[model samples]
Target: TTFVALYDYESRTETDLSFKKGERLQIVNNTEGDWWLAHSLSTGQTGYIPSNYVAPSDSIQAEEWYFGKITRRESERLLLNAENPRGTFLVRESETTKGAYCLSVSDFDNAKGLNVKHYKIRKLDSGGFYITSRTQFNSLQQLVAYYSKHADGLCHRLTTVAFRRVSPSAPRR
Candidate 1:
């Protein structure tokens, strides 16, 4: 899939582009308006278009799952904090440390780029690390295997709390 850019100057003459249902596109800029640019995955052609005329490629779908009821704890720390509200609330209450698990689905189109769904599995305790666990296959099974094999001895079985699934109407810039 390929992503096209829309500019404020070209609003009235926007055109619609076509692609296979499962194609992918990536946005080139970060804009808040509903304006969209039509992009062609096969030919790499781009044109200004209205947002309502375009939809996401069908090749990928996003899915989310939640586990069960959980309680919040005060001792948890956030891992990745490039944005605000660094720490997330714990999913399950723990006498030692609370843990939580979540999942997200992402779509990738060779012509456009990667559109990550952003799933998060949380509350995992540190376990001994091993090299065999970390390889890339772009599959959930591989991730699970890595966690199972390399997790620290203190690691507890993960439980789910809430799941959220979202698909992009346009490629994320």
Candidate 2:
């Protein structure tokens, strides 16, 4: 599986691997213990590294709730799918804001033009994220956690992660 380093790690022992954050690596083995053996793609080296310091890149990219770069229209279309129940939601990159994101949710209302709502996520210099100024979090997961429990200003409480249809034409599993 492809893994990405979440932080820079300098090898302290001869057996440890050194890697920088965002570096992609092929995790070759993981059943041993807290350390997983990985093959570093950038440096062409293989060694054990701390498991928590790296995560499966594909897993993080498609935890199912956070879709990287879907457009507003695309996100709306996804949430509006007939099978997606009310409160199903997803986070996608804001079409106009680079490095920013938006939350799209389905309310399943008869209000014609307002069943789906999009909320732009604002980032703080302190490395926090927020949809509404009234509520803020140190991370996107925290924001989602809070909103999942209460609608607050959202269209509805986020009840489920939105499903993304995988096209058969796409490459890579």
Candidate 3:
């Protein structure tokens, strides 16, 4: 989820990429102005290119914190904040899968109307969020960001165990 070449650029150094459009790469170093070190995705190639030559995804994935290890806490906060505050839903860490995590995206249709979304969310080693049968998001942030804008669809007004629960009081004391 690091910056990639905005346009194709041939390597000018031992650690640069002969990049073309839409190719993904990792920003190994960006401390120097006008120059950066980037590594090609899945290839052993490495080199430097103009600082302006590379950029991040234009999608919500361009988020500043979207380019690294996605901890559980970070995911919880963003997802919960989006749905819990609005109520009518619950997001739970589903235990239904292996080698990947599951997210139980559900909505309570008037208490008894709870529903489930078919797909589950998986965290990629590259720090991206992968949802079954859906577009891959560079970060969980992007996933939620997309759902935030597309909630009425598959997201279905749900996706967590995120809301604060109220204890039912004993019958009239």
Candidate 4:
């Protein structure tokens, strides 16, 4: 099995995640940053690990590319999601059904323009974590109508993948 070291900080002395170099890890899975789990790979033994080791297998290509003909309907949906009041809620709903999707869809007549709320529930090993925040929204029905009309133009075609080294020496703007 292949493995890579997930290092802590810039120094090699502090290591976090370690796994087989080419193993595929699923989304939302967590491995010990300083320890080794039993090998799901063929012919391997689980063992104690130091925090200073990591595996190259954990590395992923840093670039993504997509190409395809997009329709006006798709573009409209994308616009609605970008501009609608409950767009994030719609996105969360499309992705998950069990978690609570909350959005602020009210505008106060007394002051300002509108008010918005956003909330998310994240699943964790211990249990789950709930996150919430509030902002402002102009109108709820308008937002819902926007979503209803433009929810179909959100598809895309992806084509390429690329990776490059990222370090302190890299340019920043």
Candidate 5:
């Protein structure tokens, strides 16, 4: 998979690649360590880049509200600890179903009090996504934008992006 730099990285040595934010590159070697060898698409320069500085191209991994493959219970724990009011949400990969997503949101009711609500986002065979049959979106970002503006049928309108500890897969070797 290709990656796009999330921020500008200055070369620390002659062997390192200096890239501006938004530069797209292909990983030539990632098994070496935390620094991956990459070939810049724009400059044709090959050098090492810090793994955490880039994210997969055209992916929800770059979005703050996307939490990757965390389980529903984990999502609940994260949402609750955020201390955010209703409508705070994050999207996670569904555990029960492959290639599907779930929307977890903080919600409140007079009797039930504050809690997290989970909604399954179904995928269309042809290529689209929806929480319900009534509304469909071409992309996850589009879905988030629509819901942020209007709750429609959700428990509440999305208010804030859930705070994640860090980018999902930033590890050192």
Candidate 6:
């Protein structure tokens, strides 16, 4: 998985591995507790690094829940985040269209399986992302925010989940 390095560190032992601020690194090994063996995404050599020194932020995980509208690629990437990724989802760029935002949701065709829904976020000559009404979106980020409050589970959940007690009052047997 891809991770951003929060700090720079050199090996105390004989190793060439180094980390830098905001550098992207692919994890090679994630052993138990507080440390993981990481490597650059180019398939570079693995190195020992403190787990706390880094945080999982591809920027897409910014929200608390998936909101059931994420791209397929991001969804799959996060599904194996080395952490509990419940209520997380993916938002992928569409292979079918240019600048299309595909909501990686379940297929409605049958119970056997699922896929994502591609939204043509921007028209070829349009200046903004797709909108159902007035006030057009300036970007994909804005589009997601607009849709989240208005929608749910296609292939996965929203980036941040919303939950509440079954009732406001405590239940008595």
Question: Which scores better on TM-score, 3 or 6?
Answer: 6
Estimated TM-score per prediction?
Answer: 0.26, 0.63, 0.33, 0.20, 0.72, 0.36
Ranking by lDDT: 5, 2, 3, 6, 1, 4
- Scored by lDDT, the top model is 5
- The regions of model 4 sitting more than 4 angstroms off are 1-19, 24-33, 49-156, 165-173
**Per-residue lDDT of model 3, residues 107-128, tens digit only:** 4457655443334567677767
lDDT of 5 by residue, 59-134 (tens): 8776668778888878888788746878889999988888889999999888888899999998899889998888
RMSD of 1: 15.5
Task: Using TM-score, rank the candidates from best to worst.
Answer: 5, 2, 6, 3, 1, 4
Model 2, residue 43: distance off in Å is 28
Q: Which candidate leads the pack in TM-score?
A: 5
Compared with the true structure, the alpha-carbon lDDT of candidate 5 equals 0.84
Supply every candidate's count of residue pairs whose N, Cα or C atoms clash at under 3 angstroms. Answer: 10, 0, 15, 22, 0, 24
Error of 6 at 110 (Å): 10
For lDDT, candidate 5 versus 6, the one ahead is 5
TM-score of 3: 0.33
Q: Could you tell me the lDDT of residue 94 within candidate 6?
A: 58
lDDT of 2 by residue, 1-173 (tens): 58787557877779878887678888898896677889999999999888866667756353547677878878888888888888889888888877678988888656565488888998788878887788788867677888999989877898988865442221111
How far residue 89's Cα lies from its native spot in candidate 1, in Å, is 25
Question: Candidate 1: misplaced stretches above 4 Å?
Answer: 1-14, 26-32, 48-120, 123-173
Total backbone clashes of candidate 3, pairs 3 or more residues apart or in separate chains: 15
List the candidate 3 regions with Cα displacement exceeding 4 Å.
1-99, 108-112, 116-118, 123-127, 152-161, 165-173
